Each structure stands twice: as structure tokens, then as C-alpha cells.
Amino acid sequence: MGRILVIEDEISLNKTIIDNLNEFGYQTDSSENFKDGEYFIGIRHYDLVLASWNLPDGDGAELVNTIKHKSPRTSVMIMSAKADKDTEIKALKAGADDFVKKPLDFDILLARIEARLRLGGIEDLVIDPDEEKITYKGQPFEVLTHLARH
Amino acid sequence: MGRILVIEDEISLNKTIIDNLNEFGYQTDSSENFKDGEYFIGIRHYDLVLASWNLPDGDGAELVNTIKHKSPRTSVMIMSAKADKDTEIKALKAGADDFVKKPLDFDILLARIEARLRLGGIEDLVIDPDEEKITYKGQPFEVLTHLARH
């Protein structure tokens, strides 16, 4: 049960996506605009965050470069009410953590986002999830983690 | 310039994908069968490895469970000469590192696999790429790496 944030201009449509999101218990904030979502990013902590395109605050590629204020202010995931082929390709170039599309079958996205095996990555542990500073001061991998815990 | 291994039953058809692979200098071995590719996995070292389905040695879901001999013998990437909707969904459930599909536009896959921003992850460095044991015995992130190198 992760958390997936919302970046959308339509509260009805963002609730429709929030269906798929909280289908895995994803914490959400109903966005009435792209800016609404980009601030919902900062208001709370989340495991994955949508982004938009061609919204009232979505300036397309200009929004693409804008939303990554210096180092990207999260917004790892993306959303789209269409296939957004060019947008989808560009986001994949950006290596987004996830993404959602309306024409895509929602059962398929349910199975995917619900479980897609998307794995990758104490005395000295200085992990800071709030500031994205996962770190152990000092740092068979499971054995290594067990030794670190003890 | 990485390496992408091949798992396919047709040498010409797999050479078609090998085009996209060596388009980024991906080392390849022409596979005339699923077993051909699964052994090409072991013959050399690679950055990414296709897998198959419904091949002469592709037993579908049975091949899916078979190819992961105990801990998966690489084969992170997958390939398909069709949309393989069920197969694609299942592989995504497996959290594959990569994949290729024939109906998918090859320019799109060129742009993706060429550059999709897929990054993620000395005195004591005990990294073993040959045996997948990336580790530093002792172990700002760039600063940390610089300090470790010195």
C-alpha cells in the first residue's frame, strides 16, 4: 500500500484516476489544476507522484521543463486522459517512475500499478525520506541488512 | 553503449531486433531458439537480456516459471513478435528491466532503449559484476563516491 499523488485539472477525472490509485491505498489530493497537484506534492509525503501536460497550467514541453524546478520537485509519475504518444515517449525519456493513460485498459493498469515488481535501490542509518536522503552512515545483501540492523 | 542479449527462435527475426540492440552497441548472439538465448545468457556478460514466450522452448507461462531457474538466470529483458498483451502484462508483473515488441514502432523503441533514463540503485570495493555482487565492503552521494575513491 503505497501513496500516489495527483496532478490534474479535472476533479471528476482526477477522482476517476484516484479510483485506480487508492485501489492500492494510494494517498491522494483532488487536484483542480496542474498547480494544485504540484503543490499537493509538497503538502504531504508520497511514494509516487503524477504530473500533467497541456493543462491550464500544463504548458506541454514547456510545462515539462518547468515542473522540474531545478532538481525535479518529485512528480515522478505522469497522467494523461489520452494516449499522449509524444508526451508518453518524452516522459519515458525522462525515465518517469510511473504513468497512467485513459485509453489504456484500467484493469491492466490495476494489475500493473497494484503490483509490478518495481524494486530497485540504526546506529549509523541516516535515511531521510522526507528530504530524499536515504543513507546509512557506514553504508548476502539480506545478510548485510541483518548485520546492519544488529 | 550497453549490452543486450537475445532469446529467440529465428536468427533473421532476432537479427531484426539485434538491429535495435546494436543501434546502441548491444552485444548480441544470434538465437535460433529460446534455449539458444538462455545459454547465450551464460556464455558472456551482458547489461540486459531478452527472454521469449511460445517458442519451441517457450512454454508460455510454463516457460515463464521455468526460465527463472531458482534465482532468475538473468533474462531481464523480454522480446515479442506481437503485442503479447497477456505476456506483456505478466512480464511487467515480473518487473522486467526491458522488453521489445514488433507492433511497437521501432523508432519509439530506439528512442526509449537508446536513452530512457533508467538509472537506479577501491580499498574495500568488492563489486562482482560477473556474479552480480556489487558491493563496497566498507559501504553528497557523489561526494560520498569521491571520498570512497580516495
Residue numbers in the entry:
A (entry chain B), B (entry chain A): 0 to 120, 126 to 143, 151 to 161
Question: What sentences appear in the manuscript?
Answer:
Interestingly, we indeed observed single-particle images of free CosR (apo-CosR), CosR-DNA, and free DNA. The apo-CosR regulator assembles as a symmetric dimer with both subunits displaying identical conformational states. We finally refined cryo-EM structures of this apo-CosR dimer to a resolution of 3.77 Å. The final model of each subunit contains residues 1–120, 126–143, and 151–161. The cryo-EM structure of apo-CosR indicates that CosR can be divided into two domains, an N-terminal receiver domain (RD) and a C-terminal DNA-binding domain (DBD), similar to those found in the X-ray structures of the Thermotoga maritima DrrB, T. maritima DrrD, and Mycobacterium tuberculosis MtrA regulators. Residues 1–116 create the RD, whereas residues 124–221 form the DBD. All of the N-terminal RD residues are clearly visible in the apo-CosR structure; however, many of the C-terminal DBD residues, such as residues 162–221, are imperceptible with no observable cryo-EM densities. Residues 117–123 likely form a flexible linker region to directly connect the RD and DBD. Based on the structural information, apo-CosR is very flexible in nature, particularly the C-terminal DBD. However, our cryo-EM structure of apo-CosR indicates that CosR is in a dimeric form in solution.
The C. jejuni CosR regulator is essential to the viability of this bacterium and is responsible for regulating the expression of a number of oxidative stress defense enzymes. Importantly, it also modulates the expression of the CmeABC multidrug efflux system, the most predominant and clinically important system in C. jejuni that mediates resistance to multiple antimicrobials. CosR belongs to an OmpR/PhoB family of response regulators. We determined that CosR assembles as a homodimer with each CosR protomer contributing to major conformational changes to facilitate DNA binding.
